[PDB]
Write a protein that binds this DNA or RNA. Structure first.
Ligand SMILES: Nc1ncnc2c1ncn2[C@H]1C[C@H](O)[C@@H](COP(=O)(O)OP(=O)(O)OP(=O)(O)O)O1
Ligand SMILES: [Ca+2]
Ligand SMILES: [Ca+2]
Ligand SMILES: [Ca+2]
Ligand SMILES: [Ca+2]
Ligand SMILES: [Ca+2]
Length: 901
DNA sequence: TCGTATAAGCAGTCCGCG
DNA sequence: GCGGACTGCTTAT
């Protein structure tokens, strides 16, 4: 096999590299790598190295890496550009793996671990590590085993061995219900004392050294705790054995308000799963506890125990150890579904970076562009300092708040990357500028043609047409990857809808799910067999289809995120290719493209409707248009349609055969107007929306910019078995809205769009009547809590104190003195409830850590004093009033003359 | 919340508004 | 009461 790196580090003048050799074995080596950097040289000096602008460069080979670094410093002192890749390990990788990397994940040791630490005095601080580590479960991907290190004797209690038999048993048998599929994979090791546990762990670690290290909060908790605990007991040298090169750094992570410390382990790639999830999941969650995320992702129940976690080991060590094991398994189960590790390896090897750098699109793109340019003997520019400057972004149309019955939406495929490719926007493709007219002059095609030579953006920039820039070239490669995976995702989704339809008529037989590839549209033969399957087989097939779709989504959406991140990076001062001329060239072209096509679509439809000056485009945001289709439906007449699916087909056909060709012609004209390199504005139909045929449903509504709801029948070619709501911006979509309130608001919207005013009125009346019975957590608001200390004046709210922060201070007074009560962590999320007048807490609200039950000594009081009236008005009634007034209907039945009877 | 971008919504505090 | 200035938070793209 072809070799591939596992990890790479610079330590002084040495590169330390772990890698897989040509025989598939893991090796480590130290290489005294001699980097090269570049300086501009005279024309007369014959060379093969040129900067991105075509100026000649001489290569400077250094005796070692420190010499290269010192040289850069001296070039700054002289005031001359020092060109080349200044991150020497990236240059090393580029030299050592000069080809597209093929990797074999089965040879990469992925370690998933979790530790337990009993603490009788609050949260066990990793930087102090003053409490014994009493459990470690460490899953190894190569062995496919869970290694369990269990402390039987502690100053906090001596316990019996954990029992695998009891662990396997049902909760109803008094067991822990450790999944049977992992029971045979557990290797249990009990220890008489902590010193031996930790020494054995380190010896084990040496034998099975993680390449990728992950788990839940491992970077912020498990790793620093293990490091500092070993350090305290044995000393520094022993703790450094967690690094295969025996090198570690305390690394300070700074944000806006305060900073935290982590331990960098040289030669390990730490991908904390909480961070993987936050970057790649595209969720915003009320809580990020593993229990909360596992429930969300996997639909598994809460890991239940009685009493505090600080007493769980002594009261029920059996359960304590089982839950540690299950906690490790939960992360593996999340990864089996979401496939974020697979994603990270894919992108990391593609860019030729340390795998952990996938968290940084700037580093990712710096490496991609460097490797690309190097292939042509081109030399990258030096990074420069820039002040942070604001710059303009997208255009958003102000909608008229209203109901909108029939709607067709269109938007650009990969808008910003497509603009980059069309205009040829790149550091080295800048050809000059032209004299800019007001944007509206280009939108209405009255401005002078910008250039007859170069490709233009309406911000004034001109670009070469003779060759693609490196940014267009490299963005296209990742875009094509994105396109392939989205194809699989959409196929799996359409396949899912086939199975849902068949589930209306399941067969009465015992059979098996079909062995199929869900990434491809089911053949007629598969469809026929599906129609003869049992519900059990169909449901299992549905689950598999949905898992395929999830895998597709992960692969496609994060590749989309990467390419959109390159457009974004052009406007970040730390990017090597930061340039507000290019950043604004993209965003300004985008504004033009939207409003240009708005005009063209309005013109086209007014033509087929024989009208003048009527606005068919009701809304647009960045790269999208929403077209009122009422007149299209009304030209055929609702009575001519057999059912809902019939008019959906008709609008589908109209969008595809009439609108899209008109859109394409309009953009082709715009391309010529701007003299662009290549027409790549592809605005395909997204949604076909409307009420069910013959219902009183309103179809859709807008309340304002970025706030709307649509009843969708077909989304990007997926024809649903059941209509699906597309809701954007409204409170149903906000993590801050109470869970039960999101649910009720969604049902109000569903009723509005599908059934109409009366149905909405019936539901509202019932919700108002019953809601006080809802669990307090389900009706708590959620907020991130920043700057708790800033607004804390003697335990009371300072001036301008935010409502949620007030809630926290209330909580802090009510739990004061308790070392055992959960503390609210700065920067994390809290549940927030309002409090009735004259409550014992002495303020109008209370907040506590999100994803948790509020501590028992104030729970009963919080429940007694909960202000349901304020809660209902603020979270439910206010938003609903917004929805209904926009839609021009009433959530409460108005009096009429009929009441006289 | 270490980690690409801008536009823009709503909640809440403070305080004016005769 | 509402709205503007402002802070805080959270979305859509
Ligand atoms: N997270 C982001 N960071 C930077 N720019 C973004 C982000 N999200 C959206 N944009 C910008 C770039 C996008 O091309 C443009 C339109 O967004 P959107 O329609 O969601 O995706 P897209 O047009 O890139 O892909 P798709 O093909 O899925 O529509 O808005
Ligand atoms: Ca735990
Ligand atoms: Ca788009
Ligand atoms: Ca599309
Ligand atoms: Ca059937
Ligand atoms: Ca869009």
């Amino acid at each position: 096999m072809k070799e591939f790196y596992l990890t790479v580090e610079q330590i002084g003048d040495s590169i330390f590299e772990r890698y897989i050799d040509s025989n598939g074995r893991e090796r480590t080596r130290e290489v005294e790598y001699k980097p090269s950097l570049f300086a501009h040289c005279p024309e007369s000096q014959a060379t093969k190295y040129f900067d991105i602008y075509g100026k000649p460069c001489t290569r400077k080979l250094f005796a070692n890496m420190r010499d290269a670094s010192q040289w850069i410093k001296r070039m700054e002192d002289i005031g001359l550009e020092a060109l080349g890749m200044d991150d020497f390990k990236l240059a090393y990788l580029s030299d050592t793996y000069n080809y597209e990397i093929k990797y074999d994940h089965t040879k990469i040791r992925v370690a998933n671990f979790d530790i337990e630490v009993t603490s009788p005095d609050g949260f066990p601080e990793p930087s102090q590590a003053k409490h014994p580590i009493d459990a470690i479960t460490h899953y190894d991907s190569i062995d496919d085993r869970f290694y369990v290190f269990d402390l039987l004797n502690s100053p906090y209690g001596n316990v019996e061995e954990w029992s695998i038999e009891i662990a396997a048993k049902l909760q109803e048998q008094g067991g822990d219900e450790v999944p049977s599929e992992i029971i045979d994979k557990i290797i249990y090791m009990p220890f008489d004392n902590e010193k031996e546990l930790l020494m054995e762990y380190l010896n084990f670690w040496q034998q099975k050294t993680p390449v990728i290290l992950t788990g839940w909060n491992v970077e912020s908790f498990a790793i620093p705790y293990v490091y500092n605990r070993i350090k305290n007991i044995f000393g520094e040298s022993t703790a450094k054995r967690l690094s295969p090169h025996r090198k570690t750094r305390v690394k300070v992570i700074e944000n806006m308000y305060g900073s935290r410390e982590i331990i960098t382990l040289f030669g390990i790639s730490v991908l904390d799963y909480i961070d993987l999830y936050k970057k790649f999941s595209f969720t915003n969650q009320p809580s990020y506890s593993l229990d909360y995320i596992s429930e969300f992702e996997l639909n598994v129940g809460k890991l239940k125990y009685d009493g505090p976690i600080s007493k769980l080991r002594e009261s029920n060590h059996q359960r304590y150890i089982s839950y540690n094991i299950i906690a490790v398994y939960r992360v593996l189960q999340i990864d089996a579904k979401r496939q974020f590790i697979n994603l990270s390896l894919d992108m990391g090897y593609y860019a030729k970076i340390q795998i952990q750098s996938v968290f940084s699109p700037i580093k990712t793109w710096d490496a991609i562009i460097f490797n690309s340019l190097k292939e042509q003997n081109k030399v990258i520019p030096q990074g420069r300092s820039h002040p942070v400057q604001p710059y303009p972004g997208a255009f958003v149309k102000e909608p008229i708040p209203n109901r909108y019955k029939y709607v067709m939406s269109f938007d650009l495929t990969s808008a910003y990357p497509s603009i980059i490719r069309q205009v040829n926007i790149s550091p080295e493709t800048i050809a000059g500028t032209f004299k800019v007219a007001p944007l509206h002059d280009y939108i209405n095609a009255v401005a002078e043609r910008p250039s007859d030579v170069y490709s233009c953006s309406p911000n004034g920039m001109m670009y070469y047409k003779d060759r693609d820039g490196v940014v267009p070239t490299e963005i296209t490669k990742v875009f094509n990857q994105r396109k392939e995976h989205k194809g699989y995702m959409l196929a799996a989704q359409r396949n899912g809808e086939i199975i849902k339809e068949a589930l209306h008529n399941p067969n009465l037989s015992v059979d098996e799910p079909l062995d199929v590839d869900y990434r491809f549209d089911f053949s007629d033969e598969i469809k026929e067999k599906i129609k003869k399957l049992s519900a059990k087989s169909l449901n299992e097939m549905l689950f598999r289809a949905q898992r395929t779709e999830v895998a597709g989504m992960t692969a496609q959406i994060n590749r989309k995120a990467l390419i959109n991140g390159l457009a974004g990076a052009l406007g970040n001062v730390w990017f090597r290719y930061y340039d507000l001329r290019n950043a604004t060239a993209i965003t300004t072209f985008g504004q033009m493209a939207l409003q240009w096509i708005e005009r063209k679509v309005n013109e086209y439809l007014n033509e087929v409707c024989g009208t003048e000056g009527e606005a068919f485009v009701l809304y647009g945001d960045t790269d999208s248009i929403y077209v009122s289709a009422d007149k299209i439906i009304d030209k055929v007449g609702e009575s001519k349609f057999r059912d809902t699916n019939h008019w959906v087909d008709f609008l589908d056909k109209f969008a595809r055969e009439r609108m899209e060709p008109a859109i394409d012609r309009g953009f082709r004209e715009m391309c010529e107007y701007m003299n662009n390199k290549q027409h790549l504005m592809f605005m395909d139909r997204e949604a076909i929306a409307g009420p069910p045929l013959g219902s009183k449903g309103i179809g859709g509504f807008w309340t304002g910019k970025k706030r709307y709801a649509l009843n969708v029948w077909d989304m990007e070619g997926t024809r649903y078995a059941e209509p699906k709501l597309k809701i954007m911006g409204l409170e149903t979509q906000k993590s801050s809205t109470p869970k039960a309130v999101q649910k009720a608001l969604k049902e109000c919207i569903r009723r509005m769009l599908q059934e109409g005013e009366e149905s909405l009125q019936e539901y509202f009346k019932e919700f108002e009547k019953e809601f006080r019975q809802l669990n307090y957590i389900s009706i708590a608001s959620v907020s991130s809590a920043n700057n708790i200390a800033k607004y804390d004046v003697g335990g009371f709210p300072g001036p301008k104190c935010p409502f949620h922060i007030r809630g926290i201070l209330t909580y802090n007074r009510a739990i004061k003195g308790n070392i055992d009560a959960p503390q609210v962590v700065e920067g994390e999320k809290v549940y927030v409830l309002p409090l009735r007048e004259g409550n014992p807490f002495g303020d109008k609200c209370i907040a506590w850590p999100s994803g948790t039950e509020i501590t028992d000594l104030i729970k009963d009081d919080v429940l007694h004093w909960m202000d349901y009236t304020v809660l209902l008005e603020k979270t439910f009634i206010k938003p609903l009033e917004g929805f209904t007034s926009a839609a021009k209907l009433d959530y409460e039945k108005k009096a009429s003359l009929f009441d006289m009877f």
